[PDB]
Amino acid sequence: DTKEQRILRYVQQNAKPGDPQSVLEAIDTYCTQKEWAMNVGDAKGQIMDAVIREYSPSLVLELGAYCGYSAVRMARLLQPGARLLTMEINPDCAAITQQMLNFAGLQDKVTILNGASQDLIPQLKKKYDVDTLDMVFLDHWKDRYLPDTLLLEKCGLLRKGTVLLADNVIVPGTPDFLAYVRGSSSFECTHYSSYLEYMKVVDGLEKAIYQGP
């Protein structure tokens, strides 16, 4: 078995079904005590939670699901009827994510789209009936942050006030994205310094608010 399979099994055996908080705790504990994994983690998770509660987004897009940690984290704070779409290129992780969401009881709030973000983003309007996004969590490969942001704008998916929240802007880092949004009059940016998940290593999130053309 894989590390991802072991994470899911641990959750199933150490958290309570339908209790998102106990799922996060179980993942955090396994990844602290047993095997590191690239979940956004509790340190940065807490800053995400603060952002989510500030904006109360009705429709969130996540880029990069992995084992579903962040999707559980965001979905648990969504208001009734509010939705998350999460894109995941690896089918094994998409399957882990779905199972994680099911265990947590958040499956009716989340749709996991198995495919590349660059292929799926142009389908959101027609195929998934999206108008505009309220928030986007960028947490997939770091070289896609900038191209996918520009694609989101091209496809008419951003509106005035759409909140981009980007993980890992320090480690591994996303230099082209960071310099772009910070230099653009189309974004209002704020940096939230934190720590790499499960490590004493500085990391941070960037919040970039779309201001229109």
Ligand SMILES: Nc1ncnc2c1ncn2[C@@H]1O[C@H](CSCC[C@H](N)C(=O)O)[C@@H](O)[C@H]1O
């Ligand atoms: N272009 C792409 N489109 C969709 N998913 C991608 C991608 N490039 C990478 N990924 C996926 O992005 C993930 C990054 S890890 C995501 C962790 C998750 N947000 C959390 O905090 O819990 C991996 O599962 C990887 O397969």
Ligand SMILES: Oc1cc(-c2ccc(F)cc2)cc2cncnc12
């Ligand atoms: O949060 C993350 C962390 C790391 C990562 C890996 C190795 C390392 F040494 C440090 C950090 C990689 C990621 C890829 N996609 C999404 N999120 C990531």
Ligand SMILES: [Cl-]
């Ligand atoms: Cl990467």
Ligand SMILES: [Cl-]
């Ligand atoms: Cl952490």
Ligand SMILES: [Mg+2]
């Ligand atoms: Mg990350």
